[PDB]
């Protein structure tokens with residue numbers, strides 16, 4: 001009559017690192033990524049570059065940014081015409097064009113103002129290091145595989161055997177679009193891992209562009225925590241994308257988006273400390289702790305340490321509560 | 325040599341008061357308490373230093389399946405009812421006995437009649453006469469004990485302390501057999 | 502000759518409140534005998550080979566209960582001694598937490614079978630190493646008793662404290678709530694004999710209700726006992742007691758159409774899932790007043806559940822709403 005299994009929901013706004021957690025939890029406790037496994041992702045690395053570039057190429061027009069080097073007008077046309085769902089090779093009519101566009105101070109000016117449109121986060125990581133990708137003998141590094149972006153529309157569950165205990169790790173959608181489905185995997189939930197992207201504080205939602213991306217991560221949180229099937233289930237808050245906040249907080253200031261924050265500017269820490277405070281205060285039940293951790297999901301060795309400590313708490317609880 | 329005594333009866337039929345008088349040797353100090361946490365007491369009958377454990381079922385009386393958790397490995401049951409309440413004499417063969425002899429088969433029962441002093445009191449006679457009833461006489465309680473087949477019928481009162489010791493002296497010697 | 506008895510209401514009630522508060526302490530430390538005595542000692546010394554596979558089954562979830570009482574509930578009862586008006590609101594507050602008593606009660610019959618058979622020649626040893634007056638099987642009843650003594654202590658506050666204010670409404674719910682918890686615990690013993698259902702009955706939310714229905718579907722007539730939890734509804738065959746699983750419908754895919762083709766006694770429940778097919782069961786009831794009851798309540802569980810979803814898809818909007826409900 002054994003019961004050695006434990007469901008965990010990953011939840012939160014889209015683009016907050018739910019899938020990337022599952023990748024690291026695979027790297028750490030699963031079968032790693034092999035060379036053949038990586039070569040599968042090349043198509044998607046290749047794709048992401050176009051997604052990102054086309055994204056800006058359109059931003060130029062939208063925000064009336066002028067291209068500095070006339071010859072890029074062509075380049076930007078050619079690239080914007082490309083169908084991203086069919087792209088499966090980085091060949092040179094384009095490889096040069098995307099390189100030239102990335103180099104135009106006009107596109108960078110546009111990229112510096114990325115807040116004002118929907119561009120992905122690993123654009124820099126890739127578009128800076130084009131020459132490596134563009135190589136005909138490219139084979140994605142585990143970090144490249146960690147930084148790709150295949151957006152989820154489906155509840156795919158991922159089990160992981162770990163010290164004779166199985167943790168069944170659920171990966172849900174993120175955009176308003178998907179959240180209906182979430183309720184079908186609310187079944188025997190032991191703990192709610194909720195992700196917030198620290199660097200969201202200055203952006204607006206992809207689906208509805210009047211509304212601050214943290215304002216909504218915040219709303220969602222309180223909305224889930226409230227729900228009465230989660231009162232017998234712990235909640236663990238992973239404030240993600242710290243590395244991005246640390247670099248972002250030097251230009252874009254918090255207080256302009258959240259004026260309640262009375263701390264200093266360009267202070268990487270003081271900010272996240274406050275952001276954490278926002279969320280932990282929305283905890284309603286005063287007899288229940290609401291565990292928190294600052295994470296960078298593309299840092300395997302940071303995530304190794306975090307989930308390590310998270311388990312020894314999750315186990316600690318569910319032992320006392322006679323679920324094991 | 326330890327034994328296990330569980331008490332049983334209707335609400336406010338002097339279950340909790342009876343155990344306080346024995347475990348202290350004193351009346352509750354004019355504040356009738358509610359919780360008597362399980363008390364191992366040192367009694368001595370026929371020269372045998374018994375350490376009889378006392379379990380109260382105070383409140384657990386509207387909950388059919390929960391009482392059965394207090395009954396295993398039991399060696400004696402101080403089943404009782406209040407003298408000042410013939411409605412408590414009604415449930416002895418109706419609710420209690422049938423339940424008891426299932427969860428504790430062949431294990432002895434001591435019927436006890438609590439608050440004998442409230443038989444004589446005129447304030448509890450005029451109160452009962454309204455309900456077209458009367459205080460249960462002893463020649464009704466004995467016939468009940470026979471009918472259900474108890475180890476021995478006894479009477480006492482928590483205010484007097486009278487027959488309180490002698491009921492447990494019976495409850496101890498019964499725990500032997 | 503009137504107000505001198507209104508002040509006699511207070512003192513007499515403070516004795517009852519102070520019993521609760523001072524018994525909540527002796528209970529905490531009596532659980533502290535269980536948790537950090539018998540379980541701590543057994544962890545340090547070692548687990549017996551006869552009892553190795555069943556270490557936990559003895560102590561149930563008692564560790565969860567202890568640490569709640571010790572580190573939160575007791576402390577709040579101490580605040581209630583110097584603020585007795587605050588007490589009623591507190592017993593409502595934590596209706597959900599007392600679920601831990603259900604899991605313990607259900608896993609109590611198992612202790613006796615794991616204790617009274619396996620290691621009684623072992624608990625003699627630990628009882629004499631620690632040195633308690635009370636044998637293990639005495640301390641492991643404390644909560645079972647304690648949860649049905651909360652209905653009592655509050656019921657006595659209601660007698661004496663009716664005169665010291667007309668917020669018997671705060672204490673009306675407070676007592677109500679604190680009888681329902683022992684009701685669930687009592688009911689969840691019988692429903693522990695549910696064979697042939699994968700999933701823990703305990704963590705399927707509150708057992709709201711249960712009743713007997715005749716269950717058609719396009720026909721296959723059959724008398725069945727229908728349990729209704731917040732997360733699920735179970736169809737079961739009664740064995741006159743003790744029950745067997747037959748079909749389920751999780752509330753996550755539940756649907757309802759009441760008063761079928763005119764009839765007050767008939768409704769239908771429908772299961773439409775993302776991955777499964779479409780099932781549809783017609784429940785016909787005995788007392789029409791039992792049918793109607795169920796429609797109302799299920800049609801509600803749904804109404805609020807379809808609120809939740811709409812709020813997931815629009816969470817900031819729905820928390821502007823709820824912030825102005827609060828204020």
Ligand SMILES: Nc1nc2c(ncn2[C@@H]2O[C@H](COP(=O)(O)OP(=O)(O)O)[C@@H](O)[C@H]2O)c(=O)[nH]1
Pocket residue numbers: 013014015016017018019020021121122146147148149150151152174240241242243244295296297298
């Ligand atoms: N630089 C950086 N990028 C991240 C971090 N977490 C996620 N990303 C990137 O952001 C994108 C979103 O990740 P994903 O897990 O798919 O988001 P999801 O929709 O919540 O599941 C991915 O392309 C990741 O490479 C982080 O901590 N730092």
Ligand code: ALF
Pocket residue numbers: 012013014015016018019150151152153172173174175
């Ligand atoms: F925005 Al997602 F998986 F939640 F791509």
Ligand SMILES: [Mg+2]
Pocket residue numbers: 018019020150151152
């Ligand atoms: Mg994803």
